[PDB]
Design a binder for this molecule. Structure first.
Ligand SMILES: COc1ccc(C(=O)Nc2ccccc2)cc1NC(=O)CCSCc1cnc2[nH]ccc2c1
Ligand SMILES: COc1ccc(C(=O)Nc2ccccc2)cc1NC(=O)CCSCc1cnc2[nH]ccc2c1
Lengths: 252, 252
């Protein structure tokens, strides 16, 4: 592949995904997304080799609920990622449109997430920030994980390992908590610990302090409460999520 | 214990450790450190219960290379930690004094660190930021771990679990990297990836880009290089550190 193989169209995501463009492969007329990475920025961050490792794994993955990397190429000053285009936009945008999701839509999205995340763990695929703005929607409305782009909260910089500074610390126990947050946000319209100030959000997370609105059913409450456990080892696993009665009863 | 049992003296650490004071138990004349925590700040951070869990474990620990918590008490607006006083100050201060440490001093400190960290892992003791300013020195010059006080680097706040926001992500693989950084800093006088800007330090960590000065011996180079591995699973374990020939040859 070369740059000349593509017609570059409108920018996508208002910069939330980096320099990404709607594109068309000139000979096949196939619609896709092209992400442009600047070598100078990759070099200044020291991530060139980490990028190569991640894209090598991704280019071999195929899963209906993970955004596909079809391939990649480079020139003198840029690296180009050939990505699947999700025509229905982000789950964030859908949530904005509907205010909140019904139990069917939610349980279906949670199943797709649990499947995508399980697959990522088994294939050793790093993902970075599970949130509605990073979840995309395919032609049939199927959810696709797309969270692959990239004193501190982990301590002092000079002493921190690569996995901390490269955002590679979302393991399966972390993801379990994220899935509870997402389940709640899908049904309610906001994440459970949301507050005006960062300080107050911190407090609510640490205390696991949240309330269900009246419309949230007993089955959904059970699932969410069993995921949002302060103790990581006590959180309901991805396999157990897929077997939960509320998920079984409501998933398409 | 009550506040009235103690004479409170000079503040310690220039605020780097919070509100900490040199103190004396009035009846026994025993010298110790008293740390004052304000309930209002604990409550605003949502950490009251996490504090209780951590101090319960600590109050039962005894190890020559871990700073001891003798006990604790509270009143209407404060929590008080009764801590061991380390009379020789921080390893940071010692490094400032000497510029760099010889192989004997370094290997001895690394052994004490590896012992302290091993014990922490086995007893499930959370520690937060391994660096010279957080390492203290006892009456005989023995090293004591004291790192127990507390968009992001881990992603978006609303979706992050308690273990990320509470600084509880330093597991044994993270600690292995930290131990390599410390070994280098002890021998050289600065950590290996130190640079004027945060961006450049990030780059050097991600690339694992560092150089040994000529005076660093083959055995020390081997130890450091086997700890500073980009891949976490490839780092030399704490048991293997204690068995390393350079450590055996030089540790007191
Ligand atoms: C598989 O995907 C990715 C693979 C790799 C990277 C990446 O940047 N890796 C990296 C960079 C530097 C250092 C290390 C690693 C990013 C993505 N994915 C995205 O960036 C989000 C979708 S952009 C496309 C897209 C599609 N369909 C849409 N529909 C609406 C908006 C939209 C936007
Ligand atoms: C075992 O130790 C600790 C136990 C608990 C905590 C803590 O704050 N926990 C916490 C707080 C809020 C939420 C959750 C958890 C801190 C320490 N340790 C220190 O704070 C550093 C040494 S202060 C004493 C000391 C001694 N000896 C010195 N020599 C020179 C200076 C100096 C300074």
């Amino acid at each position: 592949w070369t740059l000349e193989d593509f017609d570059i169209g409108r920018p996508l995501g208002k910069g939330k995904f980096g320099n990404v463009y709607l594109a068309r492969e000139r000979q096949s007329k196939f619609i896709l997304a092209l992400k442009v990475l600047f070598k100078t920025q990759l070099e200044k961050a020291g991530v060139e080799h980490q990028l190569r490792r991640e894209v090598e794994i991704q280019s071999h993955l195929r899963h209906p609920n993970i955004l596909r990397l079809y391939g990649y190429f480079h020139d003198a000053t840029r690296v180009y990622l050939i990505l699947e285009y999700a025509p229905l936009g982000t789950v964030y945008r859908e949530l904005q449109k509907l205010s909140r999701f019904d139990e069917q839509r939610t349980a279906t999205y949670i199943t797709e997430l649990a499947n995508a995340l399980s697959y990522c763990h088994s294939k050793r695929v790093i993902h970075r920030d599970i949130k509605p703005e990073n979840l995309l929607l395919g032609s049939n409305g199927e959810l696709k994980i797309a969270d692959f782009g990239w004193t501190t909260l982990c301590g002092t910089l000079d002493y921190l390992p690569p996995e901390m500074i490269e955002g590679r610390m979302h393991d399966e126990k972390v993801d379990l908590w994220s899935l509870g947050v997402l389940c709640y946000e899908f049904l309610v319209g906001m994440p459970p610990f949301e507050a005006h100030t960062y300080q107050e959000t911190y407090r609510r997370i640490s205390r696991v302090e949240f309330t269900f609105p009246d419309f949230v059913t007993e089955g959904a409450r059970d699932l969410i409460s069993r995921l949002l456990k302060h103790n990581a080892s006590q959180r309901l696993t991805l396999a157990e999520v897929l077997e939960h009665p509320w998920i079984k009863a409501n998933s398409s």
